Design a protein around this ligand. Sequence first.
Ligand code: CLA
Ligand code: CLA
Ligand code: CLA
Ligand code: CLA
Ligand code: CLA
Ligand code: CLA
Ligand code: LHG
Ligand code: PQN
Ligand code: PQN
Lengths: 141, 739, 163, 73, 73, 80, 73, 40
Amino acid sequence: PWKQPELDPDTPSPIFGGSTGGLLRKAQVEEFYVITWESPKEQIFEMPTGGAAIMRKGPNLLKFARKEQCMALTTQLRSKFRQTPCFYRVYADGKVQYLHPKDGVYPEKVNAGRVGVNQNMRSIGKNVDPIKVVKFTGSEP
Amino acid sequence: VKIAVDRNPVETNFEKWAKPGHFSRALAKGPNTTTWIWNLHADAHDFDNHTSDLEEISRKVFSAHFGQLGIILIWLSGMYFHGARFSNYEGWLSDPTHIKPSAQVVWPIVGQEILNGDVGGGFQGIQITSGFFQLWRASGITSELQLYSTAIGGLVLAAACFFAGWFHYHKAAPKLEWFQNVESMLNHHLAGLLGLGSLAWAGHQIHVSLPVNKLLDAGVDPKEIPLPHEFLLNQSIIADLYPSFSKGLAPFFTLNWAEYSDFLTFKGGLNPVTGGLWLSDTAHHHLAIAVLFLVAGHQYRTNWGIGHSIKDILESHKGPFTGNGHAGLYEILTTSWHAQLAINLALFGSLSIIVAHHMYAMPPYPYLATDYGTQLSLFTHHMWIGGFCVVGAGAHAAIFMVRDYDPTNNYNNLLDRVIRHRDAIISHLNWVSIFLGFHSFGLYIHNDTMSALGRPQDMFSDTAIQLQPVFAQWIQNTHFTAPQLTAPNALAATSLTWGGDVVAVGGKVAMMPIALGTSDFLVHHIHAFTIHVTVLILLKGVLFARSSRLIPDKANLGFRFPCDGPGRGGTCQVSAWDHVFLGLFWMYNSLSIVIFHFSWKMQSDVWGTVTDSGVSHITGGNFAQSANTINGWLRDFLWAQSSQVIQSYGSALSAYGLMFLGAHFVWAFSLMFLFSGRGYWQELIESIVWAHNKLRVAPSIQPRALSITQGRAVGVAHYLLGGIATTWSFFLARIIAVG
Amino acid sequence: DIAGLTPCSESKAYNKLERKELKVLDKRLKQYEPGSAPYLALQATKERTENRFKTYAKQGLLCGNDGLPHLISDPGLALRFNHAGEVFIPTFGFLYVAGYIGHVGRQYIILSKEDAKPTDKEIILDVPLALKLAFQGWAWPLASIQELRNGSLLEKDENITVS
Amino acid sequence: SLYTHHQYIAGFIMCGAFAHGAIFFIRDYDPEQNKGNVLARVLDHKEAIISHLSWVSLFLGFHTLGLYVHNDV
Amino acid sequence: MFLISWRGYWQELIETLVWAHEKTPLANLVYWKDKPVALSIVQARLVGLAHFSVGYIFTYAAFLIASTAGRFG
Amino acid sequence: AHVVKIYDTCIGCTQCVRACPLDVLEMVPWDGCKAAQMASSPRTEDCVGCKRCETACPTDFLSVRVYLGNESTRSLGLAY
Amino acid sequence: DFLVHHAIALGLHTTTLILVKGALDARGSKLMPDKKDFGYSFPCDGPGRGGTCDISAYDAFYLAVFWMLNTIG
Amino acid sequence: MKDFTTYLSTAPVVGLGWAIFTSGLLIEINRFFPDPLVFS
Ligand code: CLA
Ligand code: CLA
Ligand code: CLA
Ligand code: CLA
Ligand code: CLA
Ligand code: CLA
Ligand SMILES: CCCCCCCCCCCCCCCC(=O)OC[C@H](COP(=O)(O)OC[C@@H](O)CO)OC(=O)CCCCCCCCCCCCCCC
Ligand SMILES: CC1=C(C/C=C(\C)CCC[C@H](C)CCC[C@H](C)CCCC(C)C)C(=O)c2ccccc2C1=O
Ligand SMILES: CC1=C(C/C=C(\C)CCC[C@H](C)CCC[C@H](C)CCCC(C)C)C(=O)c2ccccc2C1=O
């Protein structure tokens, strides 16, 4: 984006009684993920882990243990309610990382700033046999 | 409330018969692979996927159900017809004990006439085990002419049912409003169908079946019986049998009902002659049942401002621990068919299981308990039907969670709160299955190991470390000593299984008290192990259908999908469909032992020929000693009782010897589909397509291996068919050749 | 004779098996009355059984020590010792029928593929065409060698390969 | 026991020859070096080998089972 | 089991036992060194084939020796 | 720790990018195609191996391949 | 003795089919033109292309052992 | 009627007519000419 939005760790959360699909001991020790978005009204939405919850008008914040749990929610909000979520990654040390709209534009739209990675300039197939690379790793690279 | 119908919605013509796949958008294009063929027959009756309109889904359902009735009624009329023209009913009616039934005589081409065994009665044919002959005798049926007319009625009514399905879909189909009038259904279907239907049968019982079976049990010849219409017209005839008829409905309207004690009774027990329930007791049963359903049908609100409303009932039973409870369910059940189908199949399958228990101990029809093949075939049948129906609830409930679940309606509801502690359900239920499989099945291995080591004193058995079912034993005596204290007007007990004396008919025992011991403790606890596990597989699939930790978005993938991918270490058989595919294997392992329990127990402890000195059971009472060991089930049940099947070559039971083998082939044949995968087969077809291509003889419809979910379905189908058909041959050949 | 096998006429166990299988019916026939239909059914089975045994003996079959007829497969021994109808001749009776099915299905496939929408012609057959080919296939061996000698039977490296 | 012991081993061993023969085609096979030789000419027309094999399995399977089932009945 | 029932049913089940081991009051103090996960796909085909073949062999060895030894002929 | 390589036959459909839940794939400009787009795989550390990307590529043979390899906590999809 | 020696032939010819196929089609198939890049043993290539379960040459050896045991039985 | 004849030309309906022919032919050839094994 213009600039990465820093994390506001104190924002209101949705109205959700709780469930058993929440966070486990891995979260405090290794890492966990949090997602933010801004809603115009009070609505109901399905959580990835558990049941239904009620959003809040204004900013909202959740905490998840997996990136798929977060991106599963973005696909729901972008489609059903047509919003623009953004989620981070929090380590146990307190470090924070801004992941998904890393360029500000979603990945399915091009942008001039991006640089290609893992781009082979050949056709699928048309690559050396494993015997040529028998004693080190990799036939595709 | 009112009637609502839409006229001529659909034109009737064979235009779409020529265009298969019209119902689906994808299939209407046409086939370019052979996978289009399998998807056609599969998605044919999934009306929810064809269209989003709930109205059209309702029209299709209400009219297809008319088809199953017509399909049933020609089947039912076939039994009456085949029993009239190709049977020995008139001969069996005069000597029921010695003559065996038969209604499937065979034509004389290659071999195949030896199957027409020497049944008896100047007749030779296949021996049936469906219990129609005892049913037709429980009602007044002495001649074949009554069966012909009954068959012609079914074809007439069946065509009407087929005609209605066309009429109530193609010509004059109801609206969605007519279907959502739920309170009128229960009012009509309780009072009208169950109420008057039971009252009417009592009319047939009172006016026809009682006198006819009174004369037949008194030795009178069937041809000399007065025809059932004579009892209606002549008040004098039936009065000779039951003098209460002479008063003529004055006792009823004056509320002096004791005068009808002649034919409305509370005897209990069994008839000493027929080994079946007193026909007078059943007329009293179905009569009281009608009055009970009639008042039940006047409960709801339909139109006249009196009665209950289901919505106000549901949203008024609330609690603290539950929060918002039972609120949003009236909107669910009035909107999704799958929710109702889940509830109904569960209680329509658990009912056939109740039928299986409550018939064998309480034989309602005459001369059924002495036909051991019939009594064993009805138990095995109506139990398997219960297992399939119950498993359908787990499948047809997961479809609701995936397709017809809207989280907006369910917030802090019962359904929402169940999902929010699902990990507690499956976790606590996992511990029980492990606790039971150890303490139940481990006891069998302990007895096997102790016996092989020469330590029979340390086994679990009657002469040993006895584990006796004290609670059931106390309930047997309580129901046995009930006529004295808790039911004074009852002349005897409900059944002799609780306690009493033997009832012998034709030199064979109909029913005698069943004793429970150490072996019956282990088996009754083995059943709970298979049941709590079968629930774990289905209930896990339901709750984790919509989302899980491994796959937070399953609902977008759908109800049936093979896998998300090899990632996450592997995601094969994660859908709710694949949970049903696993639960069927456990339903099979459950009821297969409920059935072995019924066969060995009743052969050893109950059935047998009564002599002057007691009873000589079929297997000499070996259930107590041998059953504690698994080798006993292998030796004394399988190796022993398979002698009648294996030695069936050269006799009328030869068909069972072949089905016994063919059932094994189809079972093992399933293993190719379960163990293997689509990948190996699609490559093999390519090398085959080369040869078919080399000779310019190749199909334009490309050959494709079966889908993943289909290979799993094809497996469990050929698996269950071979596993079930083996018992069907092992049992009927064993029991028809008695002992 | 050959292979140490006796003819079925001279065998004792063969006649022993006949006397056994008839004794089962005679015992079963005692139960019913003379003029009843079960009696007529069993008498017919008796008549068929007596006919099955004499016809197999008349046909020069070979019965072993067990008393059951055995078949011979080599055309040399079959023709030398007059046992050709057993295996050798039915081999040509099948292959005429089997090639009939191939020559017919091969022609329906080729001809429908020369038109538009051949996929529909497989699920919805052209029955007039199928009957036409089915009654034109009496001389399929002629057409095969005609098509082989011509070279229009096989395709030539216009087929998909995998590497 | 001596017969079954060796024959069951003969099957396990022989299933390894093909398995360890398949690993050769993946890891230790060079097509350009082995060009035009017998080993490449086999791999070229493999659709014929796998097909003519499937005929023999199907042929023995139908006709052998059909006779046992013809005799069972 | 390993042949018919495949991984996805089980990994969701092990996730449920993991929840219980952490929420239990006293057992939560104990913690694994290596995380528990279900068996892989290829591993199960191997494991289930071993449980398959061993019963195929131990069953016949008993029958072969017992049938022949008891009769002594 | 899986490997994702995209090949020269990409046509800029973006169906691979829309399908991946974990945001491994993104679109980058390129001069080889009509659409003037190409995919990329900058962050394969978050890859999981669902092979939904391969399922969506409409080419004759795939312009995207997931070569499975060494596992990890993120790759095994472990919430714990 | 005739029928069994032919039924034994069913085993050897079809067991060879399963193992020969897994060898020759080890390098590539139309469903998976490059098996050689993955390896001898991998689970599958995914649910795409109609399904790719049990394609690898390891899965051919896996299925042959069932026939090895049946044949030797 | 054009659509009815087309429905009768589908695969399973034509297969049903085939099955009755081949099966009835073999049976009646075993009803008469009972128990053939050797062909004269
Ligand atoms: C001859 C009269 C007639 C005609 C011309 C039509 C014509 C039509 N109907 Mg209609 N219908 C009729 C009678 C008729 N119907 C009757 C009597 C009923 C009541 C059951 C219905 C109920 C009905 C419904 C509920 C629906 C239609 C639909 C349709 C349309 C699609 C037809 C189709 O797919 O063919 C199908 C062709 C068949 C030959 C089907 C045969 C099915 C039989 C009953 C199964 C037999 C069971 C078998 C013997 C059991 C053994 C199997 C074993 C494995 C157990 C078409 C306009 C559909 C529609 O509106 O189109 C979207 C639709 O949803 N009809
Ligand atoms: C008893 C079980 C059983 C049976 C019968 C088969 C049968 C077969 N397997 Mg198989 N398989 C099994 C278990 C079984 N397998 C198991 C447990 C595994 C381990 C996963 C495998 C693994 C396996 C592999 C890996 C391969 C096979 C192959 C084959 C085929 C070999 C060719 C042959 O002889 O066909 C002819 C033999 C038959 C017995 C034909 C069966 C049909 C008969 C005639 C009945 C006909 C139907 C009848 C008309 C009634 C139908 C009515 C109904 C539709 C209502 C054949 C279809 C190979 C193959 O397909 O190559 C061609 C192959 O590559 N199988
Ligand atoms: C007293 C009135 C009455 C009676 C007797 C019935 C009886 C029945 N209803 Mg029902 N129903 C009623 C009122 C009634 N309904 C009302 C008021 C509504 C709207 C609120 C509905 C809406 C309804 C639906 C939506 C469905 C049924 C179905 C059924 C059948 C269930 C099949 C069964 O259990 O096997 C018992 C079977 C029999 C006893 C066989 C008898 C069959 C004959 C033909 C029925 C005769 C009774 C008939 C309803 C009388 C009026 C018909 C007349 C106008 C021509 C059963 C025949 C199901 C169905 O149609 O399945 C086919 C179904 O899906 N009902
Ligand atoms: C009142 C009973 C009832 C009704 C109305 C339905 C209705 C439906 N079910 Mg359901 N189901 C039921 C009971 C019922 N089910 C039970 C008891 C079970 C547990 C076994 C299931 C398990 C089940 C599953 C697992 C699935 C369904 C699905 C479906 C839908 C698609 C129907 C379909 O594909 O069939 C069209 C017809 C066929 C496919 C033909 C069936 C052929 C069977 C398998 C063979 C029968 C063999 C025969 C009896 C014996 C062998 C002899 C042979 C030689 C002839 C439809 C809404 C599917 C779906 O997508 O739901 C949305 C699905 O995935 N159901
Ligand atoms: C005989 C074969 C067999 C056996 C023993 C099992 C055993 C089990 N299955 Mg199972 N299963 C099988 C076949 C079998 N399956 C097949 C063929 C299928 C395919 C349909 C399935 C599908 C299936 C599903 C879908 C599920 C199971 C589940 C279970 C478990 C239930 C918990 C329990 O009671 O365990 C208690 C222990 C026993 C029953 C073991 C009995 C033997 C004794 C007690 C062990 C003795 C140990 C000994 C003393 C120690 C020796 C140590 C030594 C090293 C010195 C259990 C581990 C369920 C599960 O795991 O979740 C709870 C479940 O959900 N199975
Ligand atoms: C009434 C219930 C019913 C039943 C039981 C079936 C059963 C079948 N249909 Mg089907 N179908 C139905 C209703 C039904 N359909 C309806 C209502 C429609 C809409 C009009 C269709 C439209 C339809 C199409 C368009 C096609 C089928 C096909 C098939 C067959 C699958 C192909 C196969 O496995 O053979 C594979 C066969 C071979 C590889 C070689 C040919 C040898 C065959 C087996 C001989 C002929 C079998 C014969 C039809 C059996 C008698 C009928 C039987 C049900 C009693 C299968 C027999 C397909 C087919 O080709 O049928 C044969 C097919 O293309 N069906
Ligand atoms: C068949 C025997 C099985 C018994 C053992 C099974 C134990 C497993 C269940 C544990 C779940 C506990 C959490 C409850 C869930 C809970 O918190 O819900 C709260 C609920 C009370 O609800 P409220 O009154 O708050 O609200 C009810 C309203 O919401 C109405 O919808 O508690 C109960 O109903 C107690 C149920 C005891 C359940 C145990 C008995 C179940 C079998 C019934 C027969 C028992 C007597 C048998 C002797 C003859
Ligand atoms: C065998 C098998 C196949 C191949 C099976 C196929 C292609 C089905 C074959 C269906 C045939 C065509 C039905 C017809 C069979 C007979 C011809 C019917 C007899 C007809 C005669 C009487 C004329 C799979 O595709 C598969 C996929 C996934 C897991 C396991 C498996 C699997 O085990
Ligand atoms: C039960 C089951 C599991 C779960 C099974 C587990 C976790 C059991 C393995 C752990 C236990 C504790 C080992 C039991 C000890 C063994 C009896 C002895 C092992 C001896 C080795 C050390 C040599 C799977 O992961 C699986 C995966 C794919 C297909 C099918 C299945 C499957 O069926």
